């Protein structure tokens with residue numbers, strides 16, 4: 001009804017042909033359809049508008065309208081978001097969907113407006129897997145001394161240092177070059193990102209560790225969103241609901257497709273045995289306990305309880 005022409009900028013870090021990049025184009029299509037072509041979303045993928053930290057700041061200030069980012073960089077504004085960098089929180093994607101779409105996920109999204117952001121909903125980045133260029137990693141012992149890029153918060157740094165890595169926080173947009181030049185030995189990310197950001201080309205080793213699950217938050221600038229009419233807000237939130245469903249499906253198919261592609265493209269795949277997984281859990285347990293104070297005890301306990309019920 002009350003919809004005026006709008007042009008809406010949507011930058012992101014992943015490649016345009018990643019599952020989430022394709023979901024961003026899907027969001028653009030749905031926004032156009034629901035607005036009779038009046039609201040036009042322009043996507044800028046592959047880091048064209050900067051990494052997550054810059055995208056977040058652009059939404060706060062108003063130079064950008066929409067983005068998706070990992071939860072990890074949000075921890076520098078809202079420490080409770082660091083909960084998702086704890087290892088082995090979610091047994092599988094069904095547990096993740098339930099927790100994130102339920103009250104514990106909502107409690108965290110509800111903290112965003114005070115920082116100038118609207119958490120429209122959660123999208124799936126996914127289960128993270130270790131890659132490197134030094135040696136196969138199939139044992140906890142093999143992590144020792146690996147120079148491993150991590151996401152930029154205290155939880156990620158502390159977890160990987162606790163596992164023996166030389167952990168190097170770096171923005172995602174600098175990662176391919178750091179791997180290619182061997183400024184770092186490795187990194188960790190979902191399979192479809194390892195594929196579509198081309199990290200595999202410079203990472204002969206992959207471990208199916210699935211050690212952490214990363215949500216994306218699908219974000220709007222609060223300053224911008226608040227100036228929309230209710231009908232315009234409804235286009236955005238309806239398109240966000242449609243796109244979340246599309247994105248999670250595309251992500252899960254993308255993960256299966258990525259493992260097949262990586263094996264065909266000269267990547268050597270390992271895993272941690274059940275005994276090595278046990279060693280990792282035992283090693284990180286005291287680190288996780290100490291990190292509760294930095295994240296927020298009630299957030300950690302609430303998320304763990306929600307995951308158990310799920």
Ligand SMILES: O=C(O)C(=O)C[C@H](O)[C@H](O)CO
Pocket residue numbers: 012013014051052068069070125151171172188189214
């Ligand atoms: O920083 C990482 O490794 C991530 O998993 C991805 C980033 O959030 C990326 O900017 C998403 O577009």
